Amino acid sequence: NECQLNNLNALEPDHRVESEGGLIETWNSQHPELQCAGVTVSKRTLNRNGLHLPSYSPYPQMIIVVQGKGAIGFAFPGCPETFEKPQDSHQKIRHFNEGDVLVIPPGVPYWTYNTGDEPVVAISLLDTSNFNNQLDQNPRVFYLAGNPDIEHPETMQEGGSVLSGFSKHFLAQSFNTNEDTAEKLRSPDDERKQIVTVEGGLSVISPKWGVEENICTMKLHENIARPSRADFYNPKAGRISTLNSLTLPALRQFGLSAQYVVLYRNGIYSPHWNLNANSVIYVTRGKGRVRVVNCQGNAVFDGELRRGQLLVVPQNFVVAEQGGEQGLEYVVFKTHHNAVSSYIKDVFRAIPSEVLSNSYNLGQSQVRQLKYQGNSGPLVNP
């Protein structure tokens, strides 16, 4: 019964956590649309010099940066620290800017920092139903530092880092340190919350600013937005770009992929469905008309989606979008490492003339212009 949805809604963030250095806004995971899709979303904003403290979660996250630029560090287990300075050593620092997609592995700690003047804004698809999460479907975030406010409040009906749950004496014995250091490790009077502000700026070792050439240095980010990455293009209607496991191989293990589409003013992304994955659309710019149809032939969504709105398009449901006067830009997260979609102009080319005539009571003259007259692709300029 989870996906027997009679109506679908254009959802915006329910909860908000203001922090010293930024802001986290979450969608409620209990919305029926998001339960069908088996995911929840989170919008994070890091202000200038904002440092999102190190954390991890038991499921993968696919994040698209829609504004600003910064650095992300992951702490891979037992991998060497290949960045060193004759003194501090640490692992590889990766740089991102807008249009990039980042992928966080299950259980791997990560931290991000805002490198520019403007605030970094990023929306994250928390894939809680992924086969790699062996707990349950509730969103969870384990923090290694600070005293964080609850990000997904609905999982309950301020908290602590995983280090505050241990005593300063066992932490002193455990990390061979003095009890004064051990005491600060459990963040006793920290009110900054999970995204702090680094005064003066942060300085880490980086060119742009053991060995292991294999797993310890795996690519975990790729740009999806830049115009030249288009896989489909019609200069009068728009462009589509696909990011999947053939581009970013780690996605084969996390089960996610994504598309970035851009529709020009009045451009149609004609009737289509995803064959093997649920999708989650997040509009990054503009507005336009979207119509989703289920198996009974009923439109379960029929209206305008606009910037800041989220819309779930379940597997096999037929979608169709059209950019408005300002055009429409959005990212589509899909829950498959290699999600494939299909569009109806293409299904008509593939079917014999006569089963098309007999199916829609069309003449050969009409089947022939359906089949060969366009605008072969999915992007239509009307």
CA separation for the pair 185, 365 (Å, rounded):
76
Return the residues of window 154-173 that contact a copy of itself according to CB under 8 A: 155-156, 159-166, 170-171, 173
Return the residues of window 307-336 that contact a copy of itself according to CB under 8 A: 314-316, 318, 320, 322, 335-336
Specify the residue, 117 or 215, whose C-beta has the smaller distance to a copy of itself.
215
**Vertex 180: Cα angle to 175 and 184 (nearest 5):** 80
Secondary structure letter of residue 72 according to DSSP: E
Specify the residue, 11 or 277, whose C-beta has the smaller distance to a copy of itself.
277
Backbone angles phi, psi at 178, to 5 degrees: -85, 155
Return the residues of window 314-333 that contact Mg ion according to CB under 5 A: 319
Amino acid at residue number 12: E
- DSSP letters, 171-186, are HHHHTT--HHHHHHTT
Position among 16, 18, 116, 181 found at the interface with a copy of itself (CB under 8 A): 181
Half-sphere exposure in the Cβ direction for 146 (13 Å, CA): 23
Mask for 3-32, x = binds a copy of itself (CB under 8 A): xx----------------------------
**291 lies in the site for a copy of itself, by CB under 8 A:** yes
Residue 68 interacts with which of a copy of itself, Mg ion, none, CB < 5 to 8 Å by class: none
Return the residues of window 46-105 that contact a copy of itself according to CB under 8 A: 51, 53-54, 56-58, 73-95, 105
Return the residues of window 245-264 that contact a copy of itself according to CB under 8 A: 245-247, 249-250, 259
User: Which window, 22-30, 118-126, 182-190, 280-288, contacts a copy of itself (CB under 8 A)?
Assistant: 182-190
**191 lies in the site for a copy of itself, by CB under 8 A:** no
Identify each DSSP E strand in 267-318 by its residue range.
268-274, 279-293, 299-306, 310-313
Cα 147 to its chain centre, rounded Å, is 25
Specify the residue, 110 or 330, whose C-beta has the smaller distance to Mg ion.
330
Q: How far is CA 93 from CA 3, 59, 98, 205, 216, in A?
A: 41, 22, 17, 8, 12
Binding site for Mg ion (CB under 5 A): 319
